[PDB]
Design a protein around this nucleic acid. Sequence first.
RNA 1: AUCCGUAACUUCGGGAUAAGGAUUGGCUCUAAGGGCUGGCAGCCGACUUAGAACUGGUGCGGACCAGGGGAAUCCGACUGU
RNA 2: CGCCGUUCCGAAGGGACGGGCGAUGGCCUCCGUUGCCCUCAGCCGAUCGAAAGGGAGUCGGGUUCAGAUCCCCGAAUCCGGAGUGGCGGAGAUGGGCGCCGCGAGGCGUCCAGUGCGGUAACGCGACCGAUCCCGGAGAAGCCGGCGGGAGCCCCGGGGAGAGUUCUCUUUUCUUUGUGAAGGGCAGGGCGCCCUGGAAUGGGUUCGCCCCGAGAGAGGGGCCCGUGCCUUGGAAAGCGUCGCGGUUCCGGCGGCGUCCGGUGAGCUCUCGCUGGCCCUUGAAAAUCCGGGGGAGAGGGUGUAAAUCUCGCGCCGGGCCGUA
Lengths: 135, 69, 91, 114
Amino acid sequence: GKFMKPGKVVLVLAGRYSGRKAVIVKNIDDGTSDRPYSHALVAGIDRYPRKVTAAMGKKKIAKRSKIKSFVKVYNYNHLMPTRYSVDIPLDKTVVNKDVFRDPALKRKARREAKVKFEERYKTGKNKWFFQKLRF
Amino acid sequence: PRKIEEIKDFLLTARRKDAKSVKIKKNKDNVKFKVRCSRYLYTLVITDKEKAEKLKQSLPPGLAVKELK
Amino acid sequence: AKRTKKVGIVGKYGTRYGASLRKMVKKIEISQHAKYTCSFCGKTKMKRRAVGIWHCGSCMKTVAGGAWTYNTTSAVTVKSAIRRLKELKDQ
Amino acid sequence: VQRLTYRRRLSYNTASNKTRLSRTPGNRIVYLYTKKVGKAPKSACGVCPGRLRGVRAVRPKVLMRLSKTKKHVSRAYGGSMCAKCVRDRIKRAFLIEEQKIVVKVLKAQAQSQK
RNA sequence: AUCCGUAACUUCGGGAUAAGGAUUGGCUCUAAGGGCUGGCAGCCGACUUAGAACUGGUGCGGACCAGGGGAAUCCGACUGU
RNA sequence: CGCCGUUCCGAAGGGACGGGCGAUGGCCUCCGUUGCCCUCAGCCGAUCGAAAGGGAGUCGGGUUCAGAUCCCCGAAUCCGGAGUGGCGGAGAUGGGCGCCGCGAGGCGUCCAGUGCGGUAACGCGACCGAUCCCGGAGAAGCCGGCGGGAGCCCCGGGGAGAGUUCUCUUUUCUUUGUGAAGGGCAGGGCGCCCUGGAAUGGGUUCGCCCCGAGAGAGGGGCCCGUGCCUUGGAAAGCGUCGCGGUUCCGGCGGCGUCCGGUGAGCUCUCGCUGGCCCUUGAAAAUCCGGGGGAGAGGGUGUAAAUCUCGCGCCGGGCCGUA
Ligand SMILES: [Mg+2]
Ligand SMILES: [Mg+2]
Ligand SMILES: [Mg+2]
Ligand SMILES: [Mg+2]
Ligand SMILES: [Mg+2]
Ligand SMILES: [Mg+2]
Ligand SMILES: [Mg+2]
Ligand SMILES: [Mg+2]
Ligand SMILES: [Mg+2]
Ligand SMILES: [Mg+2]
Ligand SMILES: [Mg+2]
Ligand SMILES: [Mg+2]
Ligand SMILES: [Mg+2]
Ligand SMILES: [Zn+2]
Ligand SMILES: [Zn+2]
């Protein structure tokens, strides 16, 4: 049955963020008037955390563990769905489709995803999600 | 040659330290203010004669001003 | 209408070179200029780029083929022979 | 009617001696020497026949004085690989990497029973 | 150049402009062949083809340009040197 | 005497980001330079070889007895250099918490910040990053057809000067501009994207040819724009009429430099598509993008590293040129 649901890990196929990994936040399989096609709101990693090793100091590890996130609404045709799911609770009051009216809300939407991603990254869970696909 | 559209930017151009002279050419339809900077000859085309006179009297000092005939 | 009775494509040579040579080269001229079905995409687009080199304009796949025909009888026989020996090699 | 002469000592119609006619403020026709036609980049995939988009079609040494934005596209491999084949490598890279896990799991799972 | 007509032989491609006829000026017309705008109306237009009358002391591809042809025999296939 | 040989019997590298030790210096602060060491390193062939091949970047007007894309006037451009290489812009000025106020906003703290927009093609003025790797350009034959743009030719009118005028001819002739570079827009091309799903198959060219591997139909994006408008630039040039002067003055003034049509036309050029090959139609200098992420940059600021963005500063030697 239907599988393009919130929490699904997807690969961006087209655009600036092509080849990056995101997670479906909101999925609209029937579209709207503004988007007759079926689309989803996803939050993804613009820049992945750099590899870290025991040879580095705490300051170096923290510097290399920062994440640059992005928020986008994508056509289903531009996303490759995977079998991985990431259950990061992203506040939908700030991560939603209204963030595209003004930059001020979009900055707080990308900020919200950045903090949640980094927190989940440091626990060692969802390692595949935070590794850059090599193509 | 570069064309400037607004009096605000032309005045900034005429105040540049490398601006040499301002030539005013009066045509039948417009008044053209050309300032010879280092690289380009910037031009401002003013269609209102009163503004051309107003701009003429509000040029920065020390800049050579020439009226073409 | 039908313009020639028998010369066909080798009518470009007029009366020259003799009937038998024109007859013999007629088989090749048709074959080396035909467009073959591409086994990779299915569109009738496989065309000869040079002697032995066959290219498809749809999928852009190039194939090492025969001189005048897409694949030769000798080569097709060898592929089946090499297939059988492989099975009897690893059982 | 007015007839033309070359303005240079190269009297031959070589690839570097092409011209175009130009009427001047003095109201005469003269030869202007044209620049060669530049070619947009060819996709690194080597498969797509067309050239890329969003890139100036200029001579190779003219790219030196162009800004970066004029020479690439805002995307991975942008300006070197076409979008169509970039979508295909992301899928291929992901899909092939998954099959390794599928194969690896069976190998261990089969070995586990073994 | 237009129209008609074209044999032996042939490797069926040719032979072929085979061979052989008629016509051709000037002038005045007729018909057909399109585009734009709002089975029709309006306004634009660019050269062609065909047909007819009239006409000159039968002269009209008026200068220039511009294949003579047919039936055979020997040699070499041809183009090329 | 020499010859063969040109990567083949060769210890064929005198280089580099970075790091470590000293020696010196200067806007002595801290940054340079230098020597040694560490580390890293394919190119694998010295050199020569084209005034028609490759190869950044100059055009308009005037001027001489004889030279000018070289001189002068005007307007540009490439390359290299400056970090005492200057300014602006970008990176970059956000959020949470707690106090002041009615608010605007202000203080103290704790966090982020190597840009952003579009579903996409891709766009925006920049928008860090080395060794290393991948690719692009330079860089590709001949012939046909068709189309777009130019120059020229032709047609209809307006001007200005000239010819003919015994008769006729609103007539015949001449002439009737706008450079490079920048911006804007036509036009041409796209094997580029999005929606959608097509047989009663449709679309389509002179020919073709195209489609469930996505046609028609809509809506976009990109490339070239040598065409037109504009800055250049009317001040110049030209035509004509008229005035001066030293009269060997870039002399001075009036008017004009206008409006349309058409073409298997010729010449050039750009583009699309096809045919031919037992023929497949250079190389290199040189330039560019991408993948990677070793590194560097500042702790919330007079912000830093950094910048292929806009300006500004300095220079371009040699030989040829009648
Ligand atoms: Mg671009
Ligand atoms: Mg005969
Ligand atoms: Mg002979
Ligand atoms: Mg000989
Ligand atoms: Mg040399
Ligand atoms: Mg040379
Ligand atoms: Mg040369
Ligand atoms: Mg000069
Ligand atoms: Mg379609
Ligand atoms: Mg022009
Ligand atoms: Mg004038
Ligand atoms: Mg990168
Ligand atoms: Mg000379
Ligand atoms: Zn195929
Ligand atoms: Zn491709």
